[PDB]
RNA sequence: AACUGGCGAUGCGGGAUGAACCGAACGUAGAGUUAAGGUGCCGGAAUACACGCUCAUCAGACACCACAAAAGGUGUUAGUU
RNA sequence: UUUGCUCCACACAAUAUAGAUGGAUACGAAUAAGGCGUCCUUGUGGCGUCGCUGAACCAUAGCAGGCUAGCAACGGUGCACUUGGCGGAAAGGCCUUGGGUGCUUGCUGGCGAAUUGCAAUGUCAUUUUGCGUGGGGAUAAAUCAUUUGUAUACGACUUAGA
């Protein structure tokens, strides 16, 4: 028999951890923690996504599950190079969080005619799904 | 300033308001704690205070300086004809207390208990529990369902009893009706006991036994409006007192600018509900013998 | 507001006896130009025999940090007045700018010793980056190697007053 | 089908007021779903109706209505300032009001 | 928004929840509050017991029957806080207090319906971890509330009933999802997804 | 100060296994199972190599690091209780009146009864907690031994004996009478 | 007693309440902006944003102002050798 | 003491609505942790996945939603009965096998709308009453006066009295 402990691991802040700045001039953009200033603030860079090098608060950014290898204090050019090498934005887009964000964005961007089309399609799908439930 | 000499307050603050009881019959405020292991049994009985008398008995107190000697004691004799149980009510426990769910009565109701239900009994049609017995008067019409309700719910079961005012020598003719808790067995056992004992007499020789400490719940003797001197026991004012000496001299200080609730005031004396405890049964006797 | 680093250089009023005075310069953190000149005159009065009426300010230039986007330790030597006496102290803070460094220095002074900008003098602010030179544990603990840590008990702010499921503090 | 609402639900909350003095000529309106002055700006300059029912028929109907308009915002939480043709009865504090989409600009 | 809003009290700070609910009632929203016995107060249980003992000490000298009435129930403690935060001596305050309802546990009409949460008043979200707090049920039982055990038993019964209901609902929902997957990957579903639903 | 990371290590013997849910920890080995709820301290646990458990506190103050030390010590104590077990030996010390200590069993509850302490008619009754066994050690007199798996339980039972044996209304420095904890150790000590 | 400003003689907004304090002085109305004071609810206005400190088994909470001292505490925090 | 009283549906008259204009849309517990799914030594278990707000999910097209026809209706959704239940915390609601009808926008059609005149809330879902519209319905008490004294200033109380 083995001694077993619950994993209890949740999204450490570190150098190279990519975050989603949610409020401010970017407001929903990807960046990378370049250095850790204090327990409540970090110097971050978002060169590929469009976030300038800046000191920000972990209470202003949201850490994301994914990260990539990055030397501490790396400049904007090096951070962009390693970001492109690791394809961080492709993995972010593949993640269901970004898919949810994009779905929400488009659903807010829908027009009235598109909403009517959504209604008609949803009625059709409801008919088929109720028929399937009855057949099962 | 302080009182020059200290003295205990006159009267008990836990027994006021010294007002008349809500009824002539004093209800049991709290029944004894329920125990499920013990058999179903009445926790109370209804008697009529007959009077007082004197007994002689050998005191058996192993250690008193005057032990194993005859003593004279004053005893109270209460006339207790067997109380007729008819009816049973159920109480469900709620975040608000015990709530009465339903009461189920029996087939035949006595004339005395119907008189209790009535006020102008002689000039009446005697229409009481007639349609109730019509709902009854069958084997399983609608009363067994209420019994099942009391079994499924009603964590407290209280039987309903009435006194035999006709058997007692009173000139009342109106029965006294009360509830007695059943503190034995499950709820099913309590309801079964109540149903089997529906419409019949329970004897106090079965309820209580000799050498038992019980509580007497009763309304004290009424004495009407009374002054402070006899109502609370305050001092009589001196002989040379203008406009009365059977009074409380100071009924309060300047501040607070109000007469306080704790000051002794003239008012009703007696006719209060009271629960005296630790009364030893010296005899449980029957009148079907000399 | 947020402080700004100024260099204020001024002299005494040039007289016939001694033209071209010594042209004293100071580096001071102030809200803007007016408070910068005020603080320069206050310190120059504390140090040298000259007042604002008897002198002039020949230049006041803002100094931007050479690199405002790299983390560097800062050693701040300050003197401040308490309710009892005057004390000199030395603090170390990790920050990206000198102006933000004195921002946090003033905030921490007010928080920990109830000292106000009125009562605080900044004697010196030195940028450093060498480990084993910083003397404060509350800075060396972040300058430790491969520093990574979680943020337990995440609290998410809500816009609406009512939420329809119990919150989760995971991260 | 079952929904015919062409307005936006709101609540008449109170009058414009200081701590101990109120001004009945201006009312405070809480628009439903609006939590910021930014959406309050879109709701600016828009007609409002307070619709109530009276037991007496006046002009062929038992329903009476007071007309006003969102004119400007109030505070940082999406509350707006409305001026009505007649000041609201002040018994309608926390009462349902309708904000119409006209005069429309979109 | 809703005609009636039902908030459970478990995990909520009494003062913050009372302030939020009072503001909503004044704005015109009917509110019922359940789990008032599971409501929370920040601070040590001894501190809150001492505070309630001072409250109990406060009473009219010449007639305690007209003095302040110290209700011992947790729901009435929450009501006292809310009435302190509502101007209760005017008709508007009476209207707001009529709009408010508070209960211990969740009676049938509200345990058969939805309960919402108030993040601004939640103990987990608000209190710093490690800071001591108090349970309204325990404090009420200490100061003389006589129905903690009855409410606990009734809440246990309701919780079992709700657990069985949730098991049934979860089974039905997972069957619905399985059938939706079977009837999925259709033109309509693909069109909705590509559109953005 | 808010120390960013405070980590500590607890070793486990090869014959013991530790199961750690959120903050309820059970330890099972040769002498049985022990359980502890630590839901009042906010400390994280991790397993290193099935023989080492790291106990971590993030962004904690002085009190939080003290609590981390306390939880490490408590889990250590419970692990050594499950492996070796605890034994508290107590002596009865009397000047004139022999202290009569026996074990009674009311409905099988295993009470400890003390009589003749200072020649009084008192009967000092102490409940015995679960997991604690009382033995009157042979080869030595006026000795009692409480042996158990939970150090807290055995020590609290010993403290209950001491508290009943406290003397009243007398100068204690002269009336040193009582039942005192002489030894605290392991059942498997020096084995 | 001195100088000045006020109250008396004066409302108004704020200090809950108050002759003097803080703002500001006054015809009847409308719109806008503020002063002093404030924005959890009472109560109009951020359960703002940022950094710290504090846990009190008599906490602390905004001048006039409605009180507290000497002394002490590896409680906790920050500061020469 | 010349239809009084209860229950069940209705043109018509309400100090009027503290204020519906699609839905109050039901696990619990924890938060230095959970939800769902899966796999098994069914356990404080391995693995996968989710959150990062309800910006959700249901319901939503039709004279305020008409009239009339078709296509795989093996569905969905209003109305009224008993069978089978569950729910006493304030249950007054939650389900369920059954039969009759409507509607169906799941897909395709045909006819109608106007003139409320450029906007007027432009009127839509409670407690009772009637010399009512009629179908079921078993036809009592209390008070005063008299009396009692377990009561009592008067009231009140405790009884009696065809």
Curated annotation (Swiss-Prot), chain B:
Disruption phenotype: A mutant confers resistance to trichodermin, a trichotecene toxin produced by plant-pathogenic fungi. It is found in: Cytoplasm. One of its GO terms (biological process) is translation. The modification Phosphothreonine is found at residue 102. Transmembrane segments: none annotated. Present with 450 molecules/cell in log phase SD medium. This is Large ribosomal subunit protein uL3. It comes from Saccharomyces cerevisiae (strain ATCC 204508 / S288c). The gene is RPL3.
Curated annotation (Swiss-Prot), chain C:
The gene is RPL20A. InterPro entries: Ribosomal_eL20, Ribosomal_eL20_dom, Ribosomal_eL20_eukaryotes. It is found in: Cytoplasm. One of its GO terms (cellular component) is cytosol. The keyword Protein biosynthesis does not apply. The keyword Ribonucleoprotein applies. One of its GO terms (molecular function) is structural constituent of ribosome. Present with 54300 molecules/cell in log phase SD medium. There is a cross-link at residues 124, 130, 148 (Glycyl lysine isopeptide (Lys-Gly) (interchain with G-Cter in ubiquitin)). It comes from the Eukaryota. The modification Phosphoserine is found at residue 31. This is Large ribosomal subunit protein eL20A. Component of the large ribosomal subunit (LSU). Mature yeast ribosomes consist of a small (40S) and a large (60S) subunit. The 40S small subunit contains 1 molecule of ribosomal RNA (18S rRNA) and 33 different proteins (encoded by 57 genes). The large 60S subunit contains 3 rRNA molecules (25S, 5.8S and 5S rRNA) and 46 different proteins (encoded by 81 genes). eL20 forms multiple interactions with RNA and proteins in the central protuberance, connecting components of core functional centers that are located far apart. One of its GO terms (biological process) is cytoplasmic translation. Pfam families: Ribosomal_L18A. Belongs to the eukaryotic ribosomal protein eL20 family. Keywords: Cytoplasm, Isopeptide bond, Phosphoprotein, Ribonucleoprotein, Ribosomal protein, Ubl conjugation. Disulfide bonds: none annotated. It comes from Saccharomyces cerevisiae (strain ATCC 204508 / S288c).
Curated annotation (Swiss-Prot), chain E:
Gene3D superfamilies: 1.20.5.4280, Ribosomal protein L13 (3.90.1180.10). Keywords: Acetylation, Cytoplasm, Isopeptide bond, Ribonucleoprotein, Ribosomal protein, Ubl conjugation. N-terminally acetylated by acetyltransferase NatA. The keyword Ubl conjugation applies. It is found in: Cytoplasm. There is a cross-link at residue 175 (Glycyl lysine isopeptide (Lys-Gly) (interchain with G-Cter in ubiquitin)). GO terms for cellular component: cytosol; cytosolic large ribosomal subunit; nucleolus; ribosome. PROSITE patterns: RIBOSOMAL_L13. GO terms for biological process: cytoplasmic translation; maturation of LSU-rRNA; negative regulation of translation. One of its GO terms (molecular function) is structural constituent of ribosome. Its main location: cytoplasm. CDD domains: Ribosomal_L13 (cd00392). Belongs to the universal ribosomal protein uL13 family. NCBIfam families: L13_A_E. Present with 43300 molecules/cell in log phase SD medium. Component of the ribosome, a large ribonucleoprotein complex responsible for the synthesis of proteins in the cell. The small ribosomal subunit (SSU) binds messenger RNAs (mRNAs) and translates the encoded message by selecting cognate aminoacyl-transfer RNA (tRNA) molecules. The large subunit (LSU) contains the ribosomal catalytic site termed the peptidyl transferase center (PTC), which catalyzes the formation of peptide bonds, thereby polymerizing the amino acids delivered by tRNAs into a polypeptide chain. This is Large ribosomal subunit protein uL13A. It comes from Saccharomyces cerevisiae (strain ATCC 204508 / S288c) (Baker's yeast).
UniProtKB/Swiss-Prot annotation, chain F:
It holds the Pfam family Ribosomal_L6. SUPFAM superfamilies: Ribosomal protein L6. InterPro entries: Ribosomal_uL6-like, Ribosomal_uL6-like_a/b-dom_sf, Ribosomal_uL6_a/b-dom, Ribosomal_uL6_CS2. One of its GO terms (molecular function) is structural constituent of ribosome. Component of the large ribosomal subunit (LSU). Mature yeast ribosomes consist of a small (40S) and a large (60S) subunit. The 40S small subunit contains 1 molecule of ribosomal RNA (18S rRNA) and 33 different proteins (encoded by 57 genes). The large 60S subunit contains 3 rRNA molecules (25S, 5.8S and 5S rRNA) and 46 different proteins (encoded by 81 genes). uL6 lines the binding pocket for eukaryotic elongation factor 2 (eEF2). Present with 52400 molecules/cell in log phase SD medium. There are 2 genes for uL6 in yeast. This is Large ribosomal subunit protein uL6A.
